Amino acid sequence: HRTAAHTHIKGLGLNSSGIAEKQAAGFVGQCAAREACGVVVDLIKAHKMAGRGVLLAGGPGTGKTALALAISQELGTKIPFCPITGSEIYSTEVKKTEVLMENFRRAIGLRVRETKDVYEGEVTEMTPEEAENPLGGYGKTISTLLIGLKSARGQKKLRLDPSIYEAIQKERVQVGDVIYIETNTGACKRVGRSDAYATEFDLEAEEYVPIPKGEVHKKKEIVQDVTLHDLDVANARPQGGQDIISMMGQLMKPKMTEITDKLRMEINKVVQKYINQGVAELIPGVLFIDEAHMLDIECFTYLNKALESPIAPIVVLASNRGIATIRGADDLKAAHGIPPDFLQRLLIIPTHPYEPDEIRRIVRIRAQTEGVQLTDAAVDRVAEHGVRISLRYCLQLLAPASILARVNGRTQVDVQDIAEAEELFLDARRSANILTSTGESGGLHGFIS
């Protein structure tokens, strides 16, 4: 419903032969770049190579971000696409190379089958049993809880471990509640009151729920999608157990931490066992670093190590810069704003500026996508601004002009409405002339320099 800059891009628009159709899937042109992005898509779906880099190199507005979004749609929702800008790497909580590794591991997916081994029922009876600790100083402790669970099909009495009873205390369970006890975690969930107690005459909005069907004891099979980063994080700041560390970890402020390579290599071995057991499959994906010129010499140096990792994702970089100074390396200049050293690792897909007729065709696709009707004189007039000023600028006029048209009651945008939009909404260069012309004088009405 809401329309953004890239809502018309639907895919790379390639043939089964891998050749770009000149206008397909929302694209016009970029045919050589769309064909190269097709081969990148096939590199990812092959899920065989780690740590290959791709640079989308080309001027601003030449569709580099559109192409990366098209790759994401060609891959579809199974594969991790992890998009970032270089500006996001500068965490205050952790070192910049940490957020590189987190994002590298968000780009690697895992699908895993999980058995939930679980108990369910209406709680029929519940009775604690106690230890007389002589000299601990904390007084008595509950040694077990006996609890009776009833389902539609059967019944059990469970002698719970103290740490599972603490889970039931946290869940505020009472006799006649229906509860769920996941033995994997030892977590307890209160599902509700039993429907046997269903009455209007309680002030609190209780969940009256039917008695669980089937056996009290069940095993559930669930297929889960996780990334390696989710496993890393789960094991860095543990919260799943009923031990005291897990308990207090749920109360303290969330906090990122500089997860060690020891944890990452340990979690590789964990995942490798799920793979060898056949319960998991690896789904290696792609990390898109937009604005990669905003990285710095420490980030690029780190990628030279990180891309050597035998499970690194595919990395797509976009840069819009000519010969430019490398950030953090103020003496070094290179093409794309990328160090010469790291540039040797990439496959560079250059993207090119559009012709006047391609711009005219983009205006129609974009007008159709925003749902606005133009005359051909209107389409030509807007296309002129795309040639004379900028593609981005001319596309920004479609929405203003539609309102201005509708304000006169005409449902179709014509040249008068674009002619008004041009004057209400200036481009960068008409505004820059106002700056320079007025900047002839200071005083009250000068722009502040």
With binding defined as CB under 8 A, does residue 21 bind a copy of itself?
no
Map the footprint of ligand ADP across residues 9-38, applying CB under 6 A.
9, 26-30
Map the footprint of other proteins across residues 258-287, applying CB under 8 A.
258-263, 266-267, 270-271, 273-274, 279-280, 282, 284
Residue 171 CB, shortest distance to a copy of itself, in Å, is: 18
Residue 71 CB, shortest distance to ligand ADP, in Å, is: 12
Q: What is the CA radius of gyration of the chain?
A: 31
Residue 255, both tokens: 């906090």
Map the footprint of a copy of itself across residues 261-290, applying CB under 8 A.
none
With binding defined as CB under 6 A, does residue 105 bind ligand ADP?
no
Burial class (CB in 10 A: 0-12, 13-18, 19+), 421: buried
Residue 94 contact among ligand ADP, other proteins, a copy of itself, none, beta carbon within 5 to 8 Å by kind: other proteins
Residue 78 CB, shortest distance to other proteins, in Å, is: 9
- Give the distance, in angstroms, between the CA of residue 437 and the centroid of all CA atoms in the same chain: 45
Q: What is the sign of the dihedral through the CA atoms of 338, 340, 343 and 348?
A: positive
Part in contact with other proteins (CB under 8 A); list of ranges 20-28, 220-228, 360-368, 373-381:
220-228
Closest C-alpha among 24, 30, 28 to residue 11: 24
Pattern 372-411, other proteins, x by CB under 8 A: ---------------xxxxxxx--x--xx--xx--xx---
Residue 414 CB, shortest distance to other proteins, in Å, is: 17
Pattern 378-407, ligand ADP, x by CB under 6 A: -------------xx---------------
Q: Which of 130, 258, 341, 355 binds a copy of itself (CB under 8 A)?
A: 341
- Answer yes or no: is 241 a known binding residue: no
Distance, in Å, from the CA atom of 229 to the CA atom of 51, rounded to the nearest integer, reads: 17
Strand ranges across the sheet with 346-350: 81-85, 286-290, 314-319, 53-57, 346-350
Closest C-alpha among 86, 36, 53, 55 to residue 345: 53
Select the residue whose beta carbon is closest to ligand ADP and give its number.
63
With binding defined as CB under 8 A, does residue 251 bind a copy of itself?
yes
Map the footprint of other proteins across residues 90-129, applying CB under 8 A.
90-95, 97, 106, 112, 114-120, 126-128
User: Who's near 223: CB < 8 A, 6+ residues apart?
Assistant: 111, 112, 113, 114
User: Which residue's entry shows tokens 């200071």?
Assistant: 442
Distance, in Å, from the CA atom of 435 to the CA atom of 226, rounded to the nearest integer, reads: 52
Distance, in Å, from the CA atom of 32 to the CA atom of 67, rounded to the nearest integer, reads: 12
Nearer to other proteins, 313 or 378 (CB): 313
Residue 375 CB, shortest distance to ligand ADP, in Å, is: 21
With binding defined as CB under 8 A, does residue 323 bind a copy of itself?
no
Tell me if residue 412 falls in helix, strand or coil. coil
Residue 376 CB, shortest distance to other proteins, in Å, is: 21
Residue 375 CB, shortest distance to other proteins, in Å, is: 20
Pattern 46-65, ligand ADP, x by CB under 6 A: --------------xxxxxx
Q: Which of 307, 315, 367, 374 binds other proteins (CB under 8 A)?
A: 307
Residues 57, 316: contact at Cβ < 8 Å?
Answer: no
Map the footprint of a copy of itself across residues 217-246, applying CB under 8 A.
244-245
- Answer yes or no: is 335 a known binding residue: no
Would you tell me how many other CB atoms lie within 10 Å of the CB of residue 164? 21
Size of the site for a copy of itself (CB under 8 A): 9
Residue 258, both tokens: 């500089």
Residues 349, 55: contact at Cβ < 8 Å?
Answer: yes
Closest C-alpha among 95, 101, 110, 36 to residue 312: 101
374 phi, psi to nearest 5 deg = -120, 150
The binding site for a copy of itself (CB under 8 A) comprises 244-245, 251, 332, 339-341, 448-449
